[PDB]
């Protein structure tokens, strides 16, 4: 409405309330979901054109049905971990399969301007591989973890059907624990003096504590020492994270965590 | 506690790590066990060799597997 | 870590994320191609005529932004304010020892 | 009001509240904003000037 | 809920298989750089044997 | 509260720097009438510490924090509570709601 | 009365300050630790000297890294 | 015990006042300790004299800098 009328001034237009009728059904055309996809793809190249305002609506075509690829980026940014440390931190057969599926070479998913983002609307693909329903375990694991880590959007993410929740959940929890329990924290700036701490870690034997940083291997060994049943402190961290969460809607991984952990 | 391989409840076991990145874990049978309420409770013989009885105690401090991909055991 | 592999099938993996940039723009950079700021405002619709359309149209839908743009230049247009020291920023010189200036002097 | 009421007493003038209807796309006008700065930057210099208001 | 079947018995069996799948996630490393976990001997042999399989 | 960041980290990081400041005030005499205080040279130790470093020096606190197993201490945890609790009527998605729902437990 | 290094738990070590507003850090092994069980329970041995053993006295109470950066260790 | 100053220490030093209307603070090593509830726990060497045993000993009822400016301690 307002985004187009750069001081033309009208009023109310779409009379009768939506019943999917005079509204939603507009993009079944192979040739029109094509036009959205080409306008967007072009005006991505230079967004500083006079007529770049077009993308006020063509945006949603970019990575339409690619939420899994979207989830991945968010975990990274939430964990603060590298582009691959997260990959190493995957500890489920069925989530690593989906993860191979997403990252298969020769697909240009990591090139700036490409056909890739529009494959559904551009009619390149009928059933996308980086979808959140064809990677339905990576979605649940990535989201639960991100949430347990103070995520704002994870709360309202869809909980997939027919996946290995149990196995997917301790895995998420342990990850969350690791990245939660210990932080980065190194002096960044200084004037004359600074904290040296390179070879310094343990004198030894007090221990029992969780590992130092976030080495997937160290944690997996530690977890093996706790007889593989997650420990009080872990179970507390979660309860801690998910209580105080309010107004969760059903079928979200949010309502899931809160029911799984707050007791 | 009165056992044959128990006397070494004060003796050093220096485990050399990776390189100079981390320091040795100066371990003994007294940081892993109290008296007889942990050692004479799970596979505790007197026939046990020094390293074959220490390695068991690596469970008490919950760092057997934690310290496996680290040191030369 | 430019090499990660599935520890069972031993095949390579190349973890990657979709592109994002939106790089910033610093105040200084603008003052390298242009040493002026383009103000497109003037309409020859006679100073006084505007004063009535920014009022009667200030109801709904009326009062075009061209009306308020042209009127607002109109009123503030005059030259006032003795410069009591100096003015210069970003290699641009506005005032000197003691000019006078106006809002419009940009 | 209290300001847009210097000497002459004048009440509300627009009718429909903000709601992106009346003075919305003003701040989208690369000329109104560009004038707005001018006024402000200018008066920030002569903070004491008569019409600094 | 089906009718005229053996409840005080399918539920035990079920709850057991439930406890089993529950108490034992797969959880094994899936990607690595150079080092990884392998979980060798002392994987069962240490007389912890009291907890579930 | 900004989206897509290192929450359980930026927070801890801040809790420290927050604890440091309000845990030790500059605190020092400013005007006199003949007499005043001082204690720069006069400070002793020999295991009498086990308490947070005096003043707001970065590298000292950092040491102290290395001492505390890099996890926040019950007291610096409690500090937070007292800070955040007793706030009333917060807006949604603000760092204020974040702070209260993080620390007020 | 046991090990060997435990005899010198009465005698002190002194580390010299790093700055001008500081006096030396004088520390003893009897003071840092609890009794004896604590000394071995945190990984003490008899095969040690003083400096290498008095730093393990520092750490368990949670003040190694502070000294490390305030005194000459 | 085999120390020259631990229990057998009951000598009050006449620390002159700073204000021109007061009476000297004359304290010992039991107003500042108990037995083994402070000497073993925090601070103190057996090699110290009469001043530095009461100087570092001056902390029990929580006063050292308060008596620093009001007396010539």
Swiss-Prot record, chains B, G, H:
Subcellular location: Virion; Host cytoplasm
UniProt modified residues of type Phosphoserine: 34-35, 41
Post-translational modification, as annotated: Phosphorylated in the N-terminus by host CK2. Phosphorylation of the phosphoprotein is required for the transcriptional function of the P-L complex.
Region (Interaction with the Nucleoprotein-RNA and template-binding): 53-73
Domain note: The N-terminus is disordered and is involved in binding N(0). The region of interaction with the L polymerase is necessary for transcription. The hinge region is highly variable. The central domain is involved in oligomerization. The C-terminus is basic and essential for binding the N-RNA template.
Subunit architecture: Homodimer. Interacts with the L polymerase; the association of P and L forms the polymerase complex and positions P optimally for encapsidation of newly synthesized genomes with the nucleoprotein. Interacts (via N-terminus) with N(0). Interacts (via C-terminus) with N in ribonucleocapsid (via C-terminus); this interaction allows to package the L polymerase in the virion and positions the polymerase on the template, since P acts as a bridge between N and L.
Recorded family membership: Belongs to the vesiculovirus protein P family.
Reported function: Nonenzymatic cofactor regulating the function and conformation of the RNA polymerase and part of the transcription and replication complex. Binds the viral ribonucleocapsid and positions the L polymerase on the template. Acts as a chaperone for newly synthesized free N protein, so-called N(0). Plays a role in virion assembly.
Stated name of the protein: Phosphoprotein
Gene for this chain: P
From Swiss-Prot, chain E:
Signal sequence bounds: none
Subcellular location: Virion; Host cytoplasm
Protein family according to the UniProt entry: Belongs to the vesiculovirus nucleocapsid protein family.
Subunit field text: Homomultimerizes to form the nucleocapsid. Binds to viral genomic RNA; this interaction contributes to the virion assembly. N in the nucleocapsid interacts (via C-terminus) with the P protein (via C-terminus); this interaction allows to package the L polymerase in the virion and positions the polymerase on the template, since P acts as a bridge between N and L. N(0) interacts with the P protein; this interaction prevents the uncontrolled aggregation of N(0). Interacts with the matrix protein (inner layer); this interaction contributes to the virion assembly. Interacts with the L polymerase.
Main function: Encapsidates the genome in a ratio of one N per nine ribonucleotides, protecting it from nucleases. The encapsidated genomic RNA is termed the NC and serves as template for transcription and replication. The nucleocapsid is bullet-shaped with the tip containing 8 turns of a conical spiral before reaching the helical cylindrical trunk. Nucleocapsid assembly is concomitant with replication, therefore viral replication depends on the intracellular concentration of free N, termed N(0). All replicative products are resistant to nucleases.
Record's protein name: Nucleoprotein
Organism: Vesicular stomatitis Indiana virus (strain 98COE North America)
Lineage: Viruses, Riboviria, Orthornavirae, Negarnaviricota, Haploviricotina
